[PDB]
Amino acid sequence: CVMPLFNLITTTQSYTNSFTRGVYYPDKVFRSSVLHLTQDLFLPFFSNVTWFHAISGTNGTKRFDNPVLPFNDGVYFASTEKSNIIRGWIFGTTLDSKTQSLLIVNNATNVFIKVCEFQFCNDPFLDVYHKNNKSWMESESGVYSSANNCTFEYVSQPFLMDLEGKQGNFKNLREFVFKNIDGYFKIYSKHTPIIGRDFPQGFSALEPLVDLPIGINITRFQTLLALNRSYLTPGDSSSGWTAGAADYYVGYLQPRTFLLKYNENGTITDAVDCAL
Amino acid sequence: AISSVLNDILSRLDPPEAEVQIDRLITGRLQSLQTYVTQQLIRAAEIR
Amino acid sequence: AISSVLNDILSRLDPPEAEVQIDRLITGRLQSLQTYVTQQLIRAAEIR
Amino acid sequence: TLFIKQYGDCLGDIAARDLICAQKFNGLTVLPPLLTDEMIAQYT
Amino acid sequence: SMTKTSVDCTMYICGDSTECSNLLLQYGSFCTQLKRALTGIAVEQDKNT
Amino acid sequence: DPLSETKCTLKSFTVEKGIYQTSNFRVQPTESIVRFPNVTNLCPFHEVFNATTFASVYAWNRTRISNCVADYSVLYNFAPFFAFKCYGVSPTKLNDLCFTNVYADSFVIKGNEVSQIAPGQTGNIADYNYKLPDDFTGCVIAWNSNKLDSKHSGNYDYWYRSLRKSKLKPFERDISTEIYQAGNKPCKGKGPNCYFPLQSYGFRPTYGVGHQPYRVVVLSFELLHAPATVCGPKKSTNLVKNKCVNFNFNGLTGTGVLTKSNKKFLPFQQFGRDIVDTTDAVRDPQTLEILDITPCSFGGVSVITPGTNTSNQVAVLYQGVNCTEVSVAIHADQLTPTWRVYSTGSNVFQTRAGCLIGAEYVNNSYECDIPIGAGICASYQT
Ligand SMILES: *[C@@H]1O[C@H](CO)[C@@H](O[C@@H]2O[C@H](CO)[C@@H](O)[C@H](O)[C@H]2NC(C)=O)[C@H](O)[C@H]1NC(C)=O
Ligand SMILES: *[C@@H]1O[C@H](CO)[C@@H](O[C@@H]2O[C@H](CO)[C@@H](O)[C@H](O)[C@H]2NC(C)=O)[C@H](O)[C@H]1NC(C)=O
Ligand SMILES: *[C@@H]1O[C@H](CO)[C@@H](O)[C@H](O)[C@H]1NC(C)=O
Ligand SMILES: *[C@@H]1O[C@H](CO)[C@@H](O)[C@H](O)[C@H]1NC(C)=O
Ligand SMILES: *[C@@H]1O[C@H](CO)[C@@H](O)[C@H](O)[C@H]1NC(C)=O
Numbered sequence: 001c002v003m004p005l006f007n008l009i010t011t012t013q014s015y016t017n018s019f020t021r022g023v024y025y026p027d028k029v030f031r032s033s034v035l036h037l038t039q040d041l042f043l044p045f046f047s048n049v050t051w052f053h054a055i056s057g058t059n060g061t062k063r064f065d066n067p068v069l070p071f072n073d074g075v076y077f078a079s080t081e082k083s084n085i086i087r088g089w090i091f092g093t094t095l096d097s098k099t100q101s102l103l104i105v106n107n108a109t110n111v112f113i114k115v116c117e118f119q120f121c122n123d124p125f126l127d128v129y130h131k132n133n134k135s136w137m138e139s140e141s142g143v144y145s146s147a148n149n150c151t152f153e154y155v156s157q158p159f160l161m162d163l164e165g166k167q168g169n170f171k172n173l174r175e176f177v178f179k180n181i182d183g184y185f186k187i188y189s190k191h192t193p194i195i196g197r198d199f200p201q202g203f204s205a206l207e208p209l210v211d212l213p214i215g216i217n218i219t220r221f222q223t224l225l226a227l228n229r230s231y232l233t234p235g236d237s238s239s240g241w242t243a244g245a246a247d248y249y250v251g252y253l254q255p256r257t258f259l260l261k262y263n264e265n266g267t268i269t270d271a272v273d274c275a276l
Numbered sequence: 277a278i279s280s281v282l283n284d285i286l287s288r289l290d291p292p293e294a295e296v297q298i299d300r301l302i303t304g305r306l307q308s309l310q311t312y313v314t315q316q317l318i319r320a321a322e323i324r
Numbered sequence: 325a326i327s328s329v330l331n332d333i334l335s336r337l338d339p340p341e342a343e344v345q346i347d348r349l350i351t352g353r354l355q356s357l358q359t360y361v362t363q364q365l366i367r368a369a370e371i372r
Numbered sequence: 373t374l375f376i377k378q379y380g381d382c383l384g385d386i387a388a389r390d391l392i393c394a395q396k397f398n399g400l401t402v403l404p405p406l407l408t409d410e411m412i413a414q415y416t
Numbered sequence: 417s418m419t420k421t422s423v424d425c426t427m428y429i430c431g432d433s434t435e436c437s438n439l440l441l442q443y444g445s446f447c448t449q450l451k452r453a454l455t456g457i458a459v460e461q462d463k464n465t
Numbered sequence: 466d467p468l469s470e471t472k473c474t475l476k477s478f479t480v481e482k483g484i485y486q487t488s489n490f491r492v493q494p495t496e497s498i499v500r501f502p503n504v505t506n507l508c509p510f511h512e513v514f515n516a517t518t519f520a521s522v523y524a525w526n527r528t529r530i531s532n533c534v535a536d537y538s539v540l541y542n543f544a545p546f547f548a549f550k551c552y553g554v555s556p557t558k559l560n561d562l563c564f565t566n567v568y569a570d571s572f573v574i575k576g577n578e579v580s581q582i583a584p585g586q587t588g589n590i591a592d593y594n595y596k597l598p599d600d601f602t603g604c605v606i607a608w609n610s611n612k613l614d615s616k617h618s619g620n621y622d623y624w625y626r627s628l629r630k631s632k633l634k635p636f637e638r639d640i641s642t643e644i645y646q647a648g649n650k651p652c653k654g655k656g657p658n659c660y661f662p663l664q665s666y667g668f669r670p671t672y673g674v675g676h677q678p679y680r681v682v683v684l685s686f687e688l689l690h691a692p693a694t695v696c697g698p699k700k701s702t703n704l705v706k707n708k709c710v711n712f713n714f715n716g717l718t719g720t721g722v723l724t725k726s727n728k729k730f731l732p733f734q735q736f737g738r739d740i741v742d743t744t745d746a747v748r749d750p751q752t753l754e755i756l757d758i759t760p761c762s763f764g765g766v767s768v769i770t771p772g773t774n775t776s777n778q779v780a781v782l783y784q785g786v787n788c789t790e791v792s793v794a795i796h797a798d799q800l801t802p803t804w805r806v807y808s809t810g811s812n813v814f815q816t817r818a819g820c821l822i823g824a825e826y827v828n829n830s831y832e833c834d835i836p837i838g839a840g841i842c843a844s845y846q847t
């Protein structure tokens with residue numbers, strides 16, 4: 001656990017409406033041209049979310065905003081960035097080695113999921129920097145000290161995610177939904193090109209991506225930020241760890257009855273809340 | 277069922293065993309409602 | 325019952341245990357059919 | 373806008389499944405009227 | 417007149433199930449009555465037209 | 466023959482002229498197929514059965530079983546099986562179904578507390594150390610372990626939790642050893658209103674059978690919800706399409722015809738459904754092909770008779786089915802009613818109400834006597 005000295009900035013929690021986003025497939029069953037009324041842990045329509053930001057200033061002060069947020073019954077995570085500052089998330093109750101915790105790390109070549117009794121630092125983060133001034137690489141030393149009593153390790157998803165380019169704005173509309181089932185932890189994802197600047201108005205179903213049968217206890221969740229040892233902003237001689245602009249939103253799920261509209265073609269095209 | 281009060285059965289019994297009695301009361305009250313609705317429909321036809 | 329498909333109940337249970345689930349589903353479907361026939365009879369009287 | 377016509381075939385579920393086909397598959401059949409609409413038109 | 421519908425019990429209640437069909441006979445004639453009522457309704461529709 | 470069926474239907478030996486509804490013809494299946502995944506490696510139940518130590522109930526051992534073939538015959542190879550009772554699943558049928566995720570749990574339980582391992586049970590062990598879900602859908606094997614887990618000096622290695630603020634929700638594990646507080650007085654150690662929640666069995670071989678230690682293994686398998694990966698050792702046969710057959714797709718039994726699908730399943734989905742919530746499409750576990758499921762043709766059967774006094778000739782109307790399908794099924798001996806009416810080419814007529822077999826279609830037009838449907842009527846004429 002090595003943390004360079006930084007001018008830490010108190011977290012800013014701007015509030016914004018949630019619009020109609022946050023619709024995922026309740027189950028693997030395929031239906032077409034039906035009006036399915038379902039009860040599940042959705043995201044209530046036109047709800048309110050906590051908008052955080054993460055950037056490094058030109059005055060030597062870097063905004064390090066990684067607060068600790070309740071999980072309750074679910075979390076809708078949406079992210080948008082250029083350099084993939086959000087490289088993963090950490091889940092747990094007390095954030096120590098006493099109880100098992102869930103951790104996800106993006107290796108930029110694969111996706112790492114480790115569920116052990118990790119011992120995190122005060123502000124754990126992934127150490128990414130240059131090697132021999134030729135290549136980029138990341139290290140997990142700055143996140144945890146030691147791993148003991150491991151119960152689930154997962155290394156898969158050899159996808160780089162953002163690959164189309166930065167046409168609209170980084171083309172990085174990334175949405176995740178985490179559900180704390182009794183014996184499962186589900187992840188749903190969808191990548192969308194930018195229409196506008198941030199948080200556009202539209203509908204997009206969230207197909208499931210990965211299923212985790214960990215069966216662990218989660219109460220709290222926290223997000224990890226990528227820290228690169230300079231060499232990001234051209235024309236800057238500041239030899240220090242710098243982080244690019246990062247924006248993400250967290251919504252809280254609730255037990256709601258929805259009305260999904262599967263088209264005649266396979267994909268969900270619209271949904272209506274039954275209590276809005 | 278043991279009793280005609282839902283709360284009494286709920287409090288005095290564990291869920292899995294009380295499920296049978298709650299189902300019995302549900303069946304009885306559903307039959308009562310369906311009988312009322314059927315007689316209302318017949319009387320509605322006569323009144324029409 | 326434990327499932328709405330008779331094939332599932334038949335596959336996953338022994339006959340003597342599956343009798344109960346089969347009978348529960350029979351009761352439910354018979355009640356539904358009786359309700360449908362009664363409503364159809366009243367509608368038929370009105371249409372006549 | 374409306375049943376039986378000649379629904380003995382369900383078109384192989386070319387475009388999902390209609391309500392009538394689903395109902396037919398569980399003992400719900402619609403018998404055709406005795407007088408076709410041509411005969412009703414002739415009577416009128 | 418209205419749509420003439422004929423409903424088959426055994427297919428609706430115990431569709432392709434010998435055990436359920438055998439268990440259905442224990443309920444007496446709760447299906448000959450349904451078939452008779454629906455047939456009467458259909459004949460009545462034809463008579464109405 | 467159809468006339469006898471009409472006689473049975475009317476419960477009379479004489480049949481008046483008319484058209485009667487007798488039964489429902491059905492195209493019976495020819496073959497039976499089973500499609501199971503390629504997996505062959507056996508699941509290691511013996512390792513959780515050869516567990517040299519059994520964890521305490523408050524921290525009961527839990528292991529997952531997946532991506533393997535489960536042969537529950539090895540359960541009977543164990544000798545004692547003091548309590549072998551399966552919830553929601555037939556123990557004899559365990560060898561045929563397919564489960565998605567099998568969870569195996571093991572612990573050592575009190576001799577007379579075996580009956581307390583069940584949904585909604587009352588008692589300390591039920592709601593303070595190990596709570597089963599109210600909708601438990603698995604099996605459990607229990608047996609005594611006196612000759613493995615009894616020490617003459619006493620077995621204090623195993624413990625149970627008895628004091629806590631609230632009861633445990635089902636499938637919840639509590640491992641903390643924090644002291645218990647009674648009332649509102651703060652607790653800092655052993656003393657008044659403060660007791661150690663963990664107490665030991667103190668098992669001894671000299672104790673009675675009801676006081677003997679008992680090893681218990683819990684096999685909780687979640688039912689069909691699509692991503693099945695643990696299947697029985699039943700062998701799979703070849704797949705046949707465009708023929709009414711009995712299918713068994715990954716544990717989904719039924720009867721219907723199979724065909725290629727134009728519906729595009731996304732990679733994660735396994736089987737489709739109808740709007741009336743009936744299974745309609747299934748993806749083949751082996752070839753990863755998506756197929757429809759359409760039930761074999763059926764429909765009512767109506768017998769047209771001119772009255773049993775006039776003649777014994779009858780005409781059968783197969784409601785809502787083309788004559789091609791009926792003729793093919795008859796030629797293949799698949800119709801459920803086995804009294805095939807003689808067909809001579811001109812005895813087959815296709816009405817809008819169905820297929821009329823046994824009656825000749827004339828070009829004339831008379832005031833019709835026996836109503837068939839859709840402007841078609843039948844009568845007995847020279
Ligand atoms: C429905 O899914 C199908 C998958 O093919 C898509 O259909 C194609 O649509 C394009 C654009 O109109 C046509 O050029 C192709 O000929 C279609 N292919 C077919 C019909 O096989 C279609 O885009 C989807 N509809 C959506 C997403 O609204
Ligand atoms: C339960 O006990 C087993 C040993 O009996 C522990 O170790 C597991 O052993 C099985 C084979 O018996 C392996 O397949 C697993 O990979 C092992 N798990 C490991 C090493 O973590 C097991 O950990 C125990 N489980 C619990 C929940 O206590
Ligand atoms: C979200 O929180 C803000 C806090 O000021 C509140 O004003 C707003 O109404 C909230 N949104 C909803 C939809 O309740
Ligand atoms: C990331 O991927 C590289 C290969 O690209 C591999 O060698 C390494 O172990 C992975 N994990 C890291 C750097 O944590
Ligand atoms: C791991 O398990 C051991 C053995 O039960 C236990 O003593 C220890 O506290 C656990 N945690 C760690 C971090 O080693």
Ligand SMILES: *[C@@H]1O[C@H](CO)[C@@H](O)[C@H](O)[C@H]1NC(C)=O
Nearest residue numbers: 378379380381786787788789
């Ligand atoms: C029956 O076959 C005839 C002759 O090709 C055709 O006109 C009719 O549409 C078919 N009906 C069905 C239900 O297949």
Ligand SMILES: *[C@@H]1O[C@H](CO)[C@@H](O)[C@H](O)[C@H]1NC(C)=O
Nearest residue numbers: 510511512514515516539542
């Ligand atoms: C379980 O028990 C004995 C030792 O007690 C061992 O030799 C045997 O091989 C084990 N059983 C299996 C099936 O491996």
Ligand SMILES: *[C@@H]1O[C@H](CO)[C@@H](O)[C@H](O)[C@H]1NC(C)=O
Nearest residue numbers: 093217218219634636637638
């Ligand atoms: C999970 O941990 C929280 C926080 O300590 C606790 O309140 C809750 O009871 C735990 N739930 C389970 C199922 O263990």
Ligand SMILES: *[C@@H]1O[C@H](CO)[C@@H](O)[C@H](O)[C@H]1NC(C)=O
Nearest residue numbers: 501502503504750751752753
């Ligand atoms: C099963 O084996 C067949 C060939 O026998 C192969 O085509 C198919 O992909 C395999 N299924 C798997 C590996 O899931």
